[PDB]
Write a protein that binds this ligand. Structure first.
Ligand SMILES: [Zn+2]
Ligand SMILES: [Zn+2]
Ligand SMILES: [Zn+2]
Ligand SMILES: [Zn+2]
Lengths: 150, 48, 157, 68, 23, 261, 49
């Protein structure tokens, strides 16, 4: 595991169970600002698991942050798609991307590798193998102290 | 890892700030003659 | 003190903030240039290297005009920009000379490397290569210098 | 005559090494024979790398290099 | 060749500098 | 002229559309010295070309024209060149003006600039010979080119005649049904060399020929060199044209003695 | 080491790296040490393959 040290944690509260999530905020400053904003602004809440792509990814919380614009592309080749449970980010308007079990490298360099799942709750994610919705959000560790909420 | 290609400099390494090296804190009084230039690479290179 | 900031690096002098937006814009054009675009053709591959020689040349004309032409920077900032490897010292040293004011690089006046002990073809003035062309009736079998992709760096030109 | 060596940009060496990662084109056939000619001189390059190693009081060292 | 003829021709090449293309 | 002298040559294939330098998948592990696949059996690795030459559409002036280039772009002959007007070789069909400039050099080189060899080859493949001036191109693989549909041998002859007609002065064509073989003789060596590269590994079938969607699965029409003609009418005709071209240079070999005196 | 000295010979001033920088084929630059060593790992792995 050559990946960097994670910096921001955001616990998701779904109907299936708790999804603990950690984020790389130094190595990827922009996609954290599109994520941590829309958690606290409530625009992710009550979002259904939308489209399962078998062996590739599953997609939820597609609504859009600000001005319906894009995200400045940033890649670190220490942070790659080799596992399941890796959060991604589609090039489209403000849409998540959660990698399956086949973990192919064909989805790389086309999406933004963004965060992980803390290993206690990868078993909750494997229950999906009536989609789940997002009830509550608690941002336990914000890295962006200044920008977020100001 | 044995399967990992030797990682590239300008993508992985060049943007990180370096950590501190091993320096002993020089006494402000005893080490007055040396403590400006002691830990330099080629310490007194620019003196005539 | 060449490229990355360490504890042995001195803090930057006064006028660095006003020139820093242009130097950051040269710096991100080199990062696009460093990466490998996977190119099959041998003629396309050295064409990528010519972009690096040009981007290097232009950032050194930038610091050269700020100090030797416009005098918009102090000498303490110029000594810092040399030591922190922003500007090529040995290339600026030829630009000060007479006949070398617009020289593309140092590899093109280096006589020992050539087959014939000569300069590069890009150092010959365009008036003169057009002249023996008139002897033959064919325009120019010269477009870009092999070491730079220079179309002619002569002073009169 | 004798002018000394041109000091080149450090980006020029990077680009050449990033280009030679995948040598599947026929344009690389002469350079592949140069990699086998370089193998005789590899223990000399190892000695120059290891004698110029950073000591524990310095963070980073810049060194002059010579590259094919 | 004269200097005023030389100054008018260096404006004809496009790219503003030694990478400025003739024709 | 209408096609070539007024235009500039266009780009047939973009550089991002150029095919991968790695071949498809023949064995288990790829050898990075020889650029081949190893450890297994190969599976008749020939394939048809996804591109082709469009004589009137793609010809135009190039940077080889302004510099005085003798030789022709081989990727233009294949329909693959990505430089277009930047390329240092000629993008048009060889003609009597340029072939007159390929006179001293064409004895040992071909029209693309490649050296010729003494022996031919065991299967009469790529480049020619500097011992024999062979102006006739063998055509084979016609079953693989037509994608295994049937046609009459009279209609096969015409479909060979048309696609070869553009590539230069065609001397004669004689399709054989007994051996599915086309013997296409040109006026010039330099147009046989151009046509051999241009129609190698192509498809014969036309866009209206009902299999234009599926034609990439083939093997293409093989284009090798032609052996000596065994029927005795052409051998006497070979003896005739040997004698009359001899006397033409019996004239000039006593003119440069007359210049000598 | 003190008992068996091996003396240098005065003729040998040829020095591999100086005769190699005479030719066209080698150039100079200045880089980080960690960059130079990571290059030689990549370069020596190509030679053996
Ligand atoms: Zn140059
Ligand atoms: Zn030059
Ligand atoms: Zn030049
Ligand atoms: Zn071409």
């Amino acid at each position: 595991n050559i990946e960097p040290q994670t910096t921001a944690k955001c616990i998701l509260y779904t109907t299936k169970g708790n999804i603990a999530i950690e984020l790389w905020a130094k190595e990827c400053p922009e996609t954290c600002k599109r994520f941590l904003s829309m958690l606290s602004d409530g625009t992710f809440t009550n979002g259904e698991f939308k489209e399962l792509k078998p062996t590739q990814w599953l997609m939820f919380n597609a609504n859009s942050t600000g001005e319906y614009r894009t995200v400045a592309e940033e890649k670190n080749p220490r942070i790659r798609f080799n596992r399941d449970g890796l959060l991604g980010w589609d090039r489209r308007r403000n849409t998540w991307f959660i990698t399956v079990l086949a973990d192919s490298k064909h989805v790389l360099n086309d999406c933004n590798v963004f965060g992980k799942i803390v290993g206690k709750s990868i078993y909750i994610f494997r229950e999906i193998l009536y989609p789940a919705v997002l009830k509550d959000v608690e941002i336990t560790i914000p890295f962006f102290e200044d920008i977020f909420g100001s | 890892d044995d399967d990992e290609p030797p990682l590239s400099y300008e993508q992985h390494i060049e943007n990180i700030e370096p950590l501190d090296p091993i320096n002993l804190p020089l006494d402000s009084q005893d080490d007055e003659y040396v403590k400006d230039w002691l830990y330099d690479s080629r310490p007194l290179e620019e003196d005539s | 003190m060449p490229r990355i900031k360490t504890r042995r690096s001195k803090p930057a002098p006064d006028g660095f903030e006003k020139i820093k937006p242009t130097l950051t814009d040269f710096e991100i054009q080199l990062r696009d240039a460093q990466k490998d675009k996977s190119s099959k053709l041998a003629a396309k591959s050295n064409e990528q290297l010519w972009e690096i020689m040009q981007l290097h040349h232009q950032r050194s004309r930038y610091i050269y005009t700020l100090y030797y032409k416009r005098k918009a920077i102090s000498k303490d900032l110029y000594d810092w920009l040399i030591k922190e490897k922003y500007a090529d010292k040995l290339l600026i040293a030829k630009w000060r000379k007479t006949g070398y004011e617009k020289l593309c690089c140092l590899r093109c006046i280096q006589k020992n490397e050539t087959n014939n002990g000569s300069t590069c073809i890009c150092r010959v003035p365009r008036a003169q290569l057009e002249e023996e062309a008139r002897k033959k009736g064919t325009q120019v079998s010269f477009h870009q210098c092999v070491h730079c992709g220079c179309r002619g760096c002569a002073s009169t030109d | 005559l004798y002018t000394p060596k041109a000091e080149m940009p450090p980006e020029h060496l990077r680009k050449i090494i990033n280009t030679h990662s995948d040598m599947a084109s026929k344009m690389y056939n002469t350079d592949k024979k140069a990699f086998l000619g370089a193998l005789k001189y590899l223990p000399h390059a190892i000695l120059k790398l290891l004698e110029n190693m950073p000591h524990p009081w310095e963070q980073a060292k810049e060194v002059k290099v010579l590259y094919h | 060749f004269t200097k005023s003829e030389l100054k008018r021709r260096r404006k004809t090449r496009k790219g503003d500098g030694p990478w400025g293309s003739w024709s | 002229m209408t096609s070539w002298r007024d235009k500039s040559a266009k780009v047939q294939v973009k550089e991002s559309e150029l095919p991968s330098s790695i071949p498809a998948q023949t064995g288990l592990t790829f050898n990075i010295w020889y650029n081949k696949w190893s450890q297994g059996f190969a599976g008749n690795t020939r394939f048809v070309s996804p591109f082709a030459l469009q004589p009137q559409l793609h010809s135009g002036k190039t940077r080889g024209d302004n510099d005085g280039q003798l030789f022709f772009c081989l990727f233009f002959a294949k329909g693959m060149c990505c430089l277009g007007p930047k390329c240092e070789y000629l993008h048009h069909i060889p003609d009597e003006e340029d072939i007159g400039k390929l006179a001293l050099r064409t004895e040992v080189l071909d029209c693309f600039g490649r050296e010729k060899f003494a022996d031919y080859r065991e299967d009469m493949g790529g480049i020619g010979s500097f011992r024999k001036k062979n102006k006739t191109l063998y055509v084979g693989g016609i079953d693989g080119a037509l994608n295994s549909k049937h046609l009459k041998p009279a209609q096969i002859e015409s479909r060979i005649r048309f696609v070869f007609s553009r590539l230069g002065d065609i001397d004669r064509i004689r399709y054989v049904e007994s051996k599915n073989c086309g013997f296409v003789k040109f006026k010039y060596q330099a147009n046989a060399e151009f046509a051999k590269e241009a129609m190698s590994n192509q498809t014969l079938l036309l866009p209206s020929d009902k299999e234009w969607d599926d034609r990439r699965e083939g093997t293409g029409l093989l284009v090798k060199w032609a052996n000596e003609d065994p029927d005795p009418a052409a051998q006497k005709r070979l003896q005739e044209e040997l004698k009359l071209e001899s006397l033409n240079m019996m004239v000039h070999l006593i003119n440069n003695n007359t210049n000598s005196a | 080491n003190e008992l068996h000295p091996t003396l240098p010979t005065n003729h040998n001033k040829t020095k591999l790296l100086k005769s190699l920088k005479n030719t066209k084929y080698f150039q100079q630059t200045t880089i980080d040490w960690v960059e130079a060593g990571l290059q030689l790992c990549r370069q020596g792995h190509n030679m053996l393959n």
